[PDB]
Every structure is written in structure tokens, then in C-alpha cells.
Amino acid sequence: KQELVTQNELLKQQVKIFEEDFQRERSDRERMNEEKEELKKQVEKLQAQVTLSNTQLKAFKD
Amino acid sequence: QELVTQNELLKQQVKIFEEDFQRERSDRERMNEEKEELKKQVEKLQAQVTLSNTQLKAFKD
Amino acid sequence: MQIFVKTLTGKTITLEVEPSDTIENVKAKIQDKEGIPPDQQRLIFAGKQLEDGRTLSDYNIQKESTLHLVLRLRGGMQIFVKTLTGKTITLEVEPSDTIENVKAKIQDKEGIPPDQQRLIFAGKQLEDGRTLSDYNIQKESTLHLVLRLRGG
């Protein structure tokens, strides 16, 4: 009925833990996001080439 | 006695961080699905590039 | 000797320990009783976090002392498991987890009994007794879950 102090102890601990976990999760979420952006880049680049090549191909066709 | 106010503030911090952690995990799973689709795209586009440039080598060579 | 591990809720575990046991050992015993991985547990005594490499006697923990346990939201490694219906679930794992314990975590998360679970990675069916490390399963790898009648 006044172990309040101890719960103040523990809650402060939980907060600190949860923030850490949030940050860890956010860290992973941002890294994957970068890994995703790269893939999109690559896709874009590849599309570029296959439409450049193809365009040149159509110049040779008659 | 005012430490009950602080305790409740801390409980709110707890639930808010928990919700945010979950938002981040949700986004992480979405991005895993996105990445798998993108790698599929990459493979198919690499094949397309190979075949189209071999086709073009049949001409300018 | 006995020690008591209580949580914020009030749930209290009793453990038989030795003063020379480390905090890692206490966490392993808590995993044996409650199924909580040690990298998801924080132990507190006298208001401070206990470090895994120290012993009970290092921290002045005598018999029938009581520690406090706070559960983490996540550990150090997650993998993804994709279902036939296209659902993605995220699992807390350890590199030494057996495939059987991965299936048990899937049961916890999704309710599928392990005997119905078939996990596939890199085109290979995973054997129950081997670990994630045995198959070179890394963080954020994707397993594929199929249900099967283990008898056709």
C-alpha cells in the first residue's frame, strides 16, 4: 500500500526497455526500407536498359 | 503520494511505446513482402535484358 | 537455495538456485519454467539490472531473496514465415533453436499444432531436430509454412 516506490522503480525500467525495443525495431524497419529502395533502383535501371536495347532493336526492323 | 501521477504517466509511456513498436513491426513485414516481389522483378528483368541484347547483337556485330 | 522472481503483474516464480549461479543460468531456469527466452528477460535486484555474466553471490543475493522480472517486447533475432494464403508472420528466435521449437513458436502465434507444420527453406524440408544454424537460417530469412497430414 506504499510499495508505490518499487512500482515506480519497475515502470521506469519497463519504459526504458520498451523504448529500446521500439528503437531496435525502428532500426530494422529503416534498414529494410533502404534494402527495398535499392531493389527498386535496380528494377528501374534494368527496365531502362531493356527499353533502350529494344528501342534500338526496333530501328533495325523492316 | 504524488508518485501515483508519475506511475500513471509511466504506464502511458509504456503503452505508447508498445503501440509504436507494433507499427514498426507491421511496416517491417510489409517491406519483406515488397522485397520479395522486387527480387522477382529483378530476375525477370535480367532475363529480358539478356535476351534483348543478344537479339541486338544479331544485328550490330 | 530458493529465490523468488516476481513481475509487475504479481506473478511469482520460485526457483532453486545456487549462489554461484549466473544471471544467465537464472534466466535459463526461467525459460525452462515459463518458456520466455533469456534475451527477452530483464532481471532487477535492489533497483538495478543484473548482468548475465555475473553470479547471484556477485550481487549480494542471499537465500529467499526476490528479484523482479520485466519482459522485453523483442529479442535479438526475428525470422519471417510465409503461409500458403500469403500471410507473413514474424518470429522471435535464437540461432540454436531447433525446428521443433520454431514450430512451437508458430503454434503460440497462430494456433497450428506442430505435427501439422511443414517448414521449407531454400527448397528443403526442415528436420525437427536440427537448428536454424544447421540450415544457415539468418535474421530476416523467410521460411514457407505448409500444412500436411503426417501420414497421408
SS3 per-residue string spanning chain A: CCCHHHHHHHHHHHHHHHHHHHHHHHHHHHHHHHHHHHHHHHHHHHHHHHHHHHHHHHHCCC
Question: Does C122 touch chain A if contact means CB atoms closer than 8 Å?
Answer: no
Q: Inter-chain contact C8–A25, Cβ cutoff 8 Å? A: no
SS3 per-residue string spanning chain C: CEEEEEECCCCEEEEECCCCCEHHHHHHHHHHHHCCCHHHEEEEECCEECCCCCECHHHCCCCCCEEEEEECCCCCCEEEEECCCCCEEEEECCCCCEHHHHHHHHHHHHCCCHHHEEEEECCEECCCCCECCCCCCCCCCEEEEEECCCCC
CA distance A46 to B59: 21
| Domain with A20 in it | 1-62
B20: helix, strand or coil? helix
Of C24, C23, C28, C29, residue with least CA distance to C57: C23
CA distance B27 to A26: 9
Q: How many CB atoms lie within 10 A of CB A60?
A: 11
Instruction: Answer for the pair A16, B14: CB distance below 8 angstroms, yes or no.
Output: no
CA distance C115 to C42: 33
Question: Does C80 touch chain B if contact means CB atoms closer than 8 Å?
Answer: yes
Q: Inter-chain contact B28–C73, Cβ cutoff 8 Å? A: no
* Domain count within chain A: 1
Residues 6+ apart with CB under 8 A from A42: B38, B42
Instruction: Answer for the pair B30, A32: CB distance below 8 angstroms, yes or no.
Output: no
The residues with which B59 forms a beta bridge, in sequence order, are: none
Output the furthest CA–CA distance in chain B (Å, rounded): 88
* Domain count within chain C: 2
Question: Does C73 touch chain A if contact means CB atoms closer than 8 Å?
Answer: yes
Q: Name the method of structure determination.
A: X-ray
C-alpha distances out from residue C137 to A39, A62, C133, Å: 22, 53, 6
Phi, psi of C11 (to 5 degrees): -60, 130
Of C139, B31, C90, residue with least CA distance to A30: B31
CA distance C13 to B32: 38
The residues with which C66 forms a beta bridge, in sequence order, are: C4
Record the cell numbers describing residue C51, joined without a space.
548482468
Instruction: Answer for the pair C7, C70: CB distance below 8 angstroms, yes or no.
Output: yes
Residue where one domain finishes, among candidates C48, C71, C94: C71
| Domain with C101 in it | 78-147
Query: For residue C132, what is the domain's CATH number?
Result: 3.10.20.90
C-alpha distances out from residue B33 to A31, A50, C75, C87, Å: 15, 25, 22, 9
CA distance C40 to C126: 26
C103 & C119 share domain: yes
Q: Which residue, chain included where needed, has cell 547471484?
A: C56
Of C59, C68, C90, C62, residue with least CA distance to C77: C90
What value does the CA radius of gyration of chain C take, rounded to a whole number of Å?
Answer: 18
Strand order in the sheet with C12-16: C12-16, C2-7, C66-71, C41-45, C48-49
Instruction: Answer for the pair C26, C18: CB distance below 8 angstroms, yes or no.
Output: no
Taking a contact as any Cβ pair under 8 Å apart, which residues of chain B between 2 and 61 contact chain C?
18, 21, 25, 28-29, 32-33, 36
Chains with 3 or more CB pairs closer than 8 angstroms to A? B, C
CA distance C140 to C142: 6
Of C126, C127, C139, residue with least CA distance to C95: C139
Q: Give how far C139 is from chain B: nearest CA, Å.
A: 12
Phi, psi of C119 (to 5 degrees): -105, 135
Residue where one domain finishes, among candidates C12, C39, C71: C71
In a domain, C152, yes or no: no
Residue in chain A closest to B11 (alpha carbons) equals A11
C53 & C85 share domain: no
C64 & C88 share domain: no
CA distance B48 to B56: 12
CA distance C104 to C101: 5
